[PDB]
Design a protein around this ligand. Structure first.
Ligand SMILES: N[C@@H](CCC(=O)N[C@@H](CS)C(=O)NCC(=O)O)C(=O)O
Length: 212
């Protein structure tokens, strides 16, 4: 109500927006899209990309999850998900942009097989070690003592990557090699705002498996 969210159930890109809206207490109408039979509404609201998610606020559409998250932060500023200091805001945006590199590494791992899969697993691990060492550090959350937009952007490193790891038979994010990032991902997975708003583990696995 007031806000509509066009999504796809198994997509972390959609889950990101749900978490942000719940952290802001904003009520929304969720519309599930069939990506092989896209609604007329989705095609009208996101003509450029024809992708979910799309947030519609008072009949005006915002596409692209990272753009939507910034819009939510600016439109409902209470309970900030970005810091005030411009430098710390720039560091948040920097690590969100590093998410592009992370998604690419996740994608190569997702698609890898044989000695390719072992390559991509090693490269994903190296990508995550940089994120852990230079991004997260010794903080409980990327946002410090509470989640910020960076935590939301990387939350898929828990439930989603875990499902992919199971399907692939290879675990990359593990406590022995990434103790701080693994603890972060586990803690985020156990947070009610996340745990209540991701698919059941069995459904998530079933999905990634199929996709493969
Ligand atoms: N950069 C976009 C990516 C979103 C995206 O890739 N959405 C996929 C589903 S996870 C999609 O809608 N694909 C349309 C299609 O399958 O043709 C974002 O962050 O919102």
């Amino acid at each position: 109500a007031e806000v509509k969210l066009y999504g796809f159930w198994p997509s972390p890109f959609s889950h990101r927006i749900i978490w942000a809206l719940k952290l802001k207490g904003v009520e929304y109408e969720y519309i599930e899209e069939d990506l092989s039979n896209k609604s007329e509404s989705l095609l009208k609201y996101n003509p450029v990309y024809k992708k979910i998610p799309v947030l519609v606020h008072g009949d005006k559409p915002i596409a692209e999850s990272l753009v939507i998250l910034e819009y939510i932060e600016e439109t409902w500023p209470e309970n900030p998900l970005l810091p005030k200091d411009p430098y710390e805001r720039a560091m948040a945006r920097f690590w969100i942009q590093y998410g592009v590199d992370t998604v690419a590494a996740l994608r190569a791992f997702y698609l890898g097989s044989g000695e390719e899969l072992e390559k991509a697993a090693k490269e994903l691990s190296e990508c995550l070690k940089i994120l852990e060492e230079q991004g997260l550090g010794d903080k409980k959350f990327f946002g410090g003592e509470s989640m910020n937009l960076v935590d939301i952007s990387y939350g898929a490193l828990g439930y989603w990557l875990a499902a992919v790891e199971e399907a692939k038979g290879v675990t990359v994010l593990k406590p022995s090699t990434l103790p701080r990032l693994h603890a972060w991902a586990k803690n985020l997975d156990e947070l009610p705002v996340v745990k209540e708003n991701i698919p059941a583990s069995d459904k998530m696995l079933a999905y990634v498996t199929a996709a493969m």
